[PDB]
Each structure stands twice: as structure tokens, then as C-alpha cells.
Amino acid sequence: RGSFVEMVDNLRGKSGQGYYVEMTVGSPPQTLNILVDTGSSNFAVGAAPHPFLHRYYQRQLSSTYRDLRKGVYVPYTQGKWEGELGTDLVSIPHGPNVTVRANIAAITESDKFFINGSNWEGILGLAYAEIARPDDSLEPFFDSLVKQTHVPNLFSLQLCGSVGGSMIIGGIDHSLYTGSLWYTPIRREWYYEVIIVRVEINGQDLKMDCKEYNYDKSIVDSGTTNLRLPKKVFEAAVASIKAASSTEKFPDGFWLGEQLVCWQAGTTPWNIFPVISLYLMGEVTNQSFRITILPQQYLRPVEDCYKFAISQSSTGTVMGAVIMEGFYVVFDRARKRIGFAVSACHVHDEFRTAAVEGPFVTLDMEDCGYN
Ligand SMILES: CN1C(=O)C[C@@](C)(c2cccc(NC(=O)c3ccc(OCC(F)(F)F)cn3)c2)N=C1N
Numbered sequence: 001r002g003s004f005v006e007m008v009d010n011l012r013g014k015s016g017q018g019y020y021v022e023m024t025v026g027s028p029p030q031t032l033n034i035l036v037d038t039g040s041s042n043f044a045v046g047a048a049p050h051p052f053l054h055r056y057y058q059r060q061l062s063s064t065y066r067d068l069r070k071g072v073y074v075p076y077t078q079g080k081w082e083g084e085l086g087t088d089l090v091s092i093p094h095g096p097n098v099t100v101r102a103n104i105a106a107i108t109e110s111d112k113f114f115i116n117g118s119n120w121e122g123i124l125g126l127a128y129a130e131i132a133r134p135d136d137s138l139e140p141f142f143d144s145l146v147k148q149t150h151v152p153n154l155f156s157l158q159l160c161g162s163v164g165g166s167m168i169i170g171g172i173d174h175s176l177y178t179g180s181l182w183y184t185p186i187r188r189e190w191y192y193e194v195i196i197v198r199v200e201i202n203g204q205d206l207k208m209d210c211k212e213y214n215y216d217k218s219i220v221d222s223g224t225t226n227l228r229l230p231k232k233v234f235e236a237a238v239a240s241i242k243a244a245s246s247t248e249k250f251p252d253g254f255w256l257g258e259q260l261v262c263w264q265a266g267t268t269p270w271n272i273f274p275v276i277s278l279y280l281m282g283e284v285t286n287q288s289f290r291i292t293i294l295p296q297q298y299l300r301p302v303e304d305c306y307k308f309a310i311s312q313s314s315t316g317t318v319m320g321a322v323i324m325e326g327f328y329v330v331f332d333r334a335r336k337r338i339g340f341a342v343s344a345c346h347v348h349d350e351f352r353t354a355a356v357e358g359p360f361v362t363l364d365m366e367d368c369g370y371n
């Protein structure tokens with residue numbers, strides 16, 4: 001409890017490609033790099049020699065493998081994968097010193113799924129059975145972990161945004177954050193769904209009906225890059241960001257993520273860009289708190305050229321790696337809540353730092369949840 005030195009720094013990544021943890025599958029152990037994803041619930045790994053893959057799960061080499069004689073087809077907004085289900089023994093070398101029998105989808109065919117030049121070979125879905133494929137009876141990895149061991153039912157993520165971070169499995173490490181943790185309820189256990197009750201650009205309320213902020217949900221997703229905002233909120237959001245930053249100008253396609261914008265080295269105008277604060281539902285009736293992110297988070301370097309990493313959505317708000325890089329995030333599954341604290345490692349400047357602040361008084365927070 002509170003100290004987990006062995007798990008500190010167990011995440012690696014490359015800008016834009018996601019954060020991955022080393023895992024082993026089967027006996028003898030086959031080592032793989034696995035994308036950490038709080039936005040999905042399948043443990044799926046490459047199982048065949050796709051060209052983009054450094055390595056892949058070779059089921060034939062494992063004595064502990066058990067076929068479930070069952071297929072799964074998984075389409076996404078763009079790209080898909082399909083696979084064959086089974087179970088085998090899984091470990092996390094730089095995680096808890098346990099071994100569990102987990103479901104694994106062996107990916108036999110995929111499209112627009114693996115990334116050319118990336119260093120991961122599979123994906124660890126850390127969300128709940130409700131959104132598992134093909135259905136809620138396929139038990140996600142973290143459930144199997146907690147069912148079969150003494151590992152406490154919670155994990156936490158410090159994503160530092162070439163890149164690194166920590167996934168503390170079964171606890172919290174106090175060195176990873178400064179100040180206090182503030183908790184927001186998990187509304188329903190499927191995605192890590194939360195409720196945003198208020199949005200400020202540079203301390204300026206959007207004055208939108210709060211239901212709009214959560215239309216049709218808001219979730220915390222380490223497998224998404226952007227802060228994704230519902231269409232109507234996004235319009236409001238950029239309009240207010242465009243205005244707060246009207247001190248300089250950029251093409252209209254830039255705000256739509258259809259082009260990059262570039263400045264010279266040692267000289268990006270951070271300060272003409274506003275802070276963004278999301279107030280989240282608190283643990284107590286009529287009590288909220290707010291998280292504050294910097295343009296450092298929503299203006300992401302591409303290779304000085306940057307992409308605007310706030311985008312519109314038809315699936316609701318997504319607090320991707322943009323938000324998460326500001327914070328140490330606690331997925332407290334045992335108490336159905338998400339904790340936020342200022343990350344000890346977040347990227348800032350000398351004028352502004354990311355922040356988690358409370359308590360604030362906010363009424364009718366229940367009306368902010370879409371049904
Ligand atoms: C959004 N999403 C999906 O569309 C489906 C799924 C399974 C998925 C599938 C394939 C790839 C990914 N995610 C990524 O490639 C990715 C890339 C960069 C990411 O962040 C990088 C940075 F940290 F922002 F720099 C996070 N995830 C997610 N999970 C999701 N969370």
C-alpha cells in the first residue's frame with residue numbers, strides 16, 4: 001500500500017503511438033509489448049506474422065494454452081480485427097509477482113489495427129465485461145487477476161508525455177503525484193464513465209447545459225490521444241479557444257485537425273493559448289472538483305509542428321492521453337471511483353501548471369448525466 005518501486009516506470013511509448021507494458025503469455029513465457037487501454041475490455045494479441053509486428057503469440061509453443069473453440073470479430077470506427085479465443089497463463093514482469101489464467105484473443109486477421117513502426121503487439125483492455133467482445137461473459141484480464149489473486153481491485157496510471165510512465169497494479173504510489181487525490185464516481189461499470197458538470201476556458205464558463213458535456217457519455221480512455229468533445233461542446237469549446245487566442249491566427253482546417261501548424265524552435269507561443277478546466281462530479285452531494293490542463297497537453301508535437309488534439313465526437317467526451325498526461329489517475333474499481341491528482345511528471349512551463357482543486361459547490365449534478 002502506497003509504495004510499489006518495482007512497478008514505477010514500467011510503461012514505454014512513442015509520441016502518438018500509445019503506452020505499452022511488457023507482458024508474458026503461455027509456458028514457457030512469451031514476452032510481448034501490450035498497449036494499455038482503459039477504453040476497451042479485450043486482452044487481444046497478434047498471433048500470426050503480420051509485417052508490422054516485432055513478434056507475436058505462438059500458441060503452438062505453449063503447454064498451458066486452452067482453446068475455447070470460439071471466434072471473435074471486432075470492428076471499430078476505422079479498422080478491425082478478428083481472432084480465436086483461448087486462455088493461457090499471463091504475467092506482468094514489472095507488475096505484481098503473480099500468474100493468472102486469462103482469456104486471450106489470438107488475432108489472426110486485422111486491418112488498420114497494428115501501427116507500422118510501433119513497438120506493441122497487442123492490447124490490454126482494462127475496462128469492464130459489459131463492453132467485452134463478443135459479450136459480457138468473456139472475463140476481462142483485470143477481473144481474472146482480482147478473482148484469482150490477492151491483488152487489490154484497483155490500478156493507477158501515470159502517463160508522462162520517447163515517452164514513459166507507470167502502471168501501478170493493485171495500488172497507488174505516493175511519489176507519482178503531488179497534493180491531494182480527488183475522486184469522481186464511476187457512473188456505470190462498462191467504460192470508465194464519469195460526469196462533467198462544468199467546463200471553463202481560461203476560467204470562463206461555457207454556460208452550456210451540462211448534459212451537453214456528457215452527450216452521450218464521458219469516459220477516461222488511455223487508448224485515445226485526444227481530448228474528444230461532443231460536437232456541440234466542441235464548437236463552443238474552439239470558438240472560445242479561437243477567441244482566447246485571437247492574438248495570433250491559424251487556418252480554419254487546423255481547428256478541425258486537417259492540418260498542422262508550425263513555429264520556430266525555442267519559441268512556441270504557449271501563453272496566448274488558454275487553460276482548460278473540467279469540473280467533475282464529486283463524492284458528496286452538491287460537491288465538485290476541477291482538473292486544469294495546459295496547451296502543452298492539447299497541443300501535441302508531431303514528427304516545431306503541432307497538432308490540435310481536441311476533436312469533435314459522436315460518442316461523447318473522451319478524456320484521452322491528452323488529459324491523462326496532466327495527472328496521476330487512480331482507477332479505484334473497489335469503490336467505483338476515479339481519482340485525479342497532479343502528476344509529479346507532467347509537462348508544463350514556469351507560468352502555468354496543471355491542477356486539481358476542490359471542493360466547489362455545484363447543484364443539480366445529476367441532471368448532467370445523459371439517459
Ligand atoms: C479509442 N479506442 C478504439 O478505437 C479501439 C481500441 C481497442 C484501440 C485500438 C487500436 C489502437 C488504439 N489506440 C492507439 O493506437 C493509441 C495511440 C496513441 C495513444 O496515445 C498516445 C499519446 F499518449 F497520446 F501520445 C493512445 N492510443 C485503441 N481502444 C480504444 N480506446
Ligand code: NA
Nearest residue numbers: 146147149150
Ligand atoms: Na482476490
Ligand code: NA
Nearest residue numbers: 174175177178
Ligand atoms: Na505525493
